[PDB]
Ligand binder design. Sequence first.
Ligand SMILES: CN(C)S(=O)(=O)n1cc(-c2nc(-c3nc(C4(c5ccccc5)CC4)n(C)n3)cnc2N)cn1
Length: 820
Amino acid sequence: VKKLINSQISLLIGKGLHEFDSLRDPEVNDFRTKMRQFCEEAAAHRQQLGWVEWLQYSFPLQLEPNRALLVNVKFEGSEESFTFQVSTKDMPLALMACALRKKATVFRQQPEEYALQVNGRHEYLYGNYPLCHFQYICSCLHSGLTPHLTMVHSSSILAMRDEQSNLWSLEQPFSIELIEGRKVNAMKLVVQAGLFHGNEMLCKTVSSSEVNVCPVWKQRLEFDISVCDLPRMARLCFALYAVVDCPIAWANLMLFDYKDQLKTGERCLYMWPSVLLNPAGTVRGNPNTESAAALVIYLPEVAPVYFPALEKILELLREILERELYEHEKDLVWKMRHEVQEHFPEALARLLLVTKWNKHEDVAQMLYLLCSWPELPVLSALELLDFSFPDCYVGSFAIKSLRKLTDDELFQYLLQLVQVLKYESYLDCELTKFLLGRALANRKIGHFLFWHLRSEMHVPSVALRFGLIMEAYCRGSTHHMKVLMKQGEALSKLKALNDFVKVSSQKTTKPQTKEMMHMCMRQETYMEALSHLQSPLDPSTLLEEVCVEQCTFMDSKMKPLWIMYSSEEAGSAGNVGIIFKNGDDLRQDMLTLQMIQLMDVLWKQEGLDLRMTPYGCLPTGDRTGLIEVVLHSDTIANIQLNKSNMAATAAFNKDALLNWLKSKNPGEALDRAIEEFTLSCAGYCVATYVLGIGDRHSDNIMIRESGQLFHIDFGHFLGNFRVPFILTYDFVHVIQQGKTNNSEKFERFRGYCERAYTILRRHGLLFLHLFALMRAAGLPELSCSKDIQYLKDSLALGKTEEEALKHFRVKFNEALRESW
Ligand SMILES: CN(C)S(=O)(=O)n1cc(-c2nc(-c3nc(C4(c5ccccc5)CC4)n(C)n3)cnc2N)cn1
């Protein structure tokens, strides 16, 4: 029975569970036993949750960050629907009451026993919120479409739930013995070593003797640090390089084990290929024992030595600087450490960075303060997750403060909280426990954590950790694992179909490839596999029947697939599409869209909706991911082609954009589209300036028929070809209602840019903490300090709001002066 569940996890996580046993590692084995138990306890509490608490799990409320409307409501066991005239200020309960009252008159004879499902979607409408607070209601309000909802009784929700049940004495200096190696390079081999506590050295780097390219050393490597002065999270970093300078390989390893004991004696280090000394890199060796270079080293015995328990640890001009600092300034903060705890709690990061981690006496005093430190705000806790703060006690304190994250906030920073797992030193961590816990408490987080892990199973350095986490997750939800398997089955078929599409395009005409895509899709295995699955881009979006005749592929290099769906129940909300792309890395594209989505959220909170189109984009595997189709939209380029026998017949190229709008928004409807275009253009002007998105042209900027402008292809960001502000006459013409001179409309638009820019600037540090946590991903255009600096400069965070708004107008006018 459980053998199949074991076999299913294996196929789903892309790694056989036998591989975890083969290693014969007590860290892997104890992670698996503990996590499985923690995950089963989380699945248990979930099986005894009240029917509303289950809705908050399976279907978490999609709520937005007066005027009456028509709402079509039906029940389960019938096709009979009723169309009401409810208000946007109405709670769902009142609508639930009307549905029950109108059911009573039809059937000739309580709303607290119901939930309003969104037709053909895993989304529901419940809670003490007026209808206009629900994202589905607002999407129906702007598009003028009618909300189709189903009355789902408590027992029918409980049916779902039931059918888804599962020490100070060692004063000697720290030393090692560098024995021999087994590598490849064409010169002499020097092995530089070093001791690290995060980004910083605990003592000066000590090198090896230049031994011939042919390698044996047997050398003694002593460090400028005491054995009792090694912090718990001490990292020993190595670097193999050839010289007559050229790097070869790198390896790191913790001086303490997962059981807190100091490591002894012989250790073989399967090194990772190099591009100086890399302290950020993984403390687990290269899994390719066949082609990897090795480093045998000795950890000399000093006897069993365990790091002291917290009980033994606990037993042992100021304001003007608190807004990169000199040694006298550092000494001040450490002297004033108690006054920091008491009156400046948010300064903890600056106090943690000044403490001497190379002295056990210092660390303990700091830890005594930390154990009595008040909870920091979410923003302050997000800063503490960086590699800059490696201490376990610090790491735990950050999670302790992060527990007040709303499931909404957690979903906005999950990509960063997953990347941060790469910085980890051991498999068993409070971050994993947290991520897993929240994943098992909320299925949307459960879904997205999985895909963020699964999309990296091909990267050897993180394959064990991630594979292990996904396995632990799968223990806490047998049902969801089965649902995630259907997603993997669709994606498996999609890659095979794409592979054919790629070959056929190199051999025949497009209508010929398109018809055989269809033939291949119409097969039993493809028809079943690609149908009735929760979208990997949004688990609430149900990709029901695959609309094969409406499926094509794109002419761009990697021949992306256009997969259109339809649902009877959902009707028009069921008419959804997904773009499968295979060959490019969708990580930056996703991060950029997420950063845009956040900007929209920060703006929407301050009552400003700049009509942004933050379409889904999710990497699912090796250079494989999905893109959300923005239906009823086309590229500026295609609209500018100006085809004959159309309604968009333009005399001048400038008119093409506005003529297009005029045909898609007839009569009075056009006035709306121009405000849509102005608001979205303003938003994307700021977004792309702040983020530094370059290589913009008509082929990667799109328009919705609604008027809404948006951007695609974010392969380049942070000015990586200092990019200027962007302004095109084709857009200014549209903003100015199609008139040569209309400054009333243009100066209102100049306001939209300024306001959006100032709101973002107020959360500059949020973008700074999120990007600094992202560095863990290994994104080539987000690899160092120079990259974070682009954001610091585009957001002018080292200047006041007045000095920044003037400096912005300067960039805005120079973008307007370049506009023809
Ligand atoms: C740069 N890329 C190719 S991409 O990076 O793959 N990418 C596409 C998107 C994307 N596109 C569209 C869209 N595109 C087309 C068009 C079309 C469709 C089908 C066959 C041939 C042409 C180009 C007319 N329409 C009509 N819609 C919608 N929502 C998206 N989210 C985002 N990123």
